[PDB]
Write a protein that binds this ligand. Sequence first.
Ligand SMILES: *[C@@H]1O[C@H](CO)[C@@H](O)[C@H](O)[C@H]1NC(C)=O
Length: 332
Amino acid sequence: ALTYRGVDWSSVVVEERAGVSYKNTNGNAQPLENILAANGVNTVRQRVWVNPADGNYNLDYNIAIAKRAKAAGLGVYIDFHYSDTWADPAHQTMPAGWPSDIDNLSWKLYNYTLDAANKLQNAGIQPTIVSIGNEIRAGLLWPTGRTENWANIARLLHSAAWGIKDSSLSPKPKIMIHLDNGWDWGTQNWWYTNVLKQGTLELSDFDMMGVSFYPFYSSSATLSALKSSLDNMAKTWNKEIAVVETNWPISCPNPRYSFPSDVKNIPFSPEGQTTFITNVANIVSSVSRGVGLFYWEPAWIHNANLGSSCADNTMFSQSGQALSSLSVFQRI
Ligand SMILES: *[C@@H]1O[C@H](CO)[C@@H](O)[C@H](O)[C@H]1NC(C)=O
């Protein structure tokens, strides 16, 4: 059903350097990319930071693992955070050295994106998907692209999109805009409506709408709300749709928020993960042009809670062995 069955495996090299030895379900040591491929994954998502001090997630880091993904027969989804560090609705920190004025910033953004795209092409990497920003629900490149600076946001995204379109990438990747809280139709609608009404960024400038969907940051994140929101997004703008980030815990003894009503019966276990993932996948497939699902960081065992209040959201044992839930990608 789904065109893209993936996971974000960005931390792979960070973990291997930390001594992690990944193993398949039989317990046989094997490269992570091959384990993922063997379990049905056909696309890997990777976060790209501009100039991180320690180099993790910078372009070189990403080209190195992208080559490995390619060798395993996996497509690559590049997620530009357009920051030197984590970008989310509460943080869209300007890359060091980048100008603040809209005119020069727009040009910098175009240059950076164009340059990165060409370097990827030159390394033989043609991502199938490229998101111009990560969870830019509150904008990007703050404060210049901070909501409600809609004019600036539209202008910046237009520049980023064309940095891709003017690149040597062949074939070209699908261009994606990624917002958090996919279940929140009101916000999705508020954002796209205000950005698109500016006129600079046109509907034709991008191809996909991605959303994050997590069950442990608000009980409002019901599967019902996700279905309704995605359906509304699909019929309003008719773009391809995907849940680009999601997690389900194998352990959550200390949640900060109550879980959504329609997922309360799913247990915190590998079996529970397969049920949740399969359900979210099928929700996406039931949507017009719903084409993808990406699990976030299933193998980051040294950050098991994956930034959430739940103790463990990974799909690998603490020794690095893939859990039974990883095969879910063979059934969606
Ligand atoms: C963008 O790159 C061009 C070279 O093609 C350069 O002349 C220009 O100064 C750059 N813009 C910014 C703001 O870095």
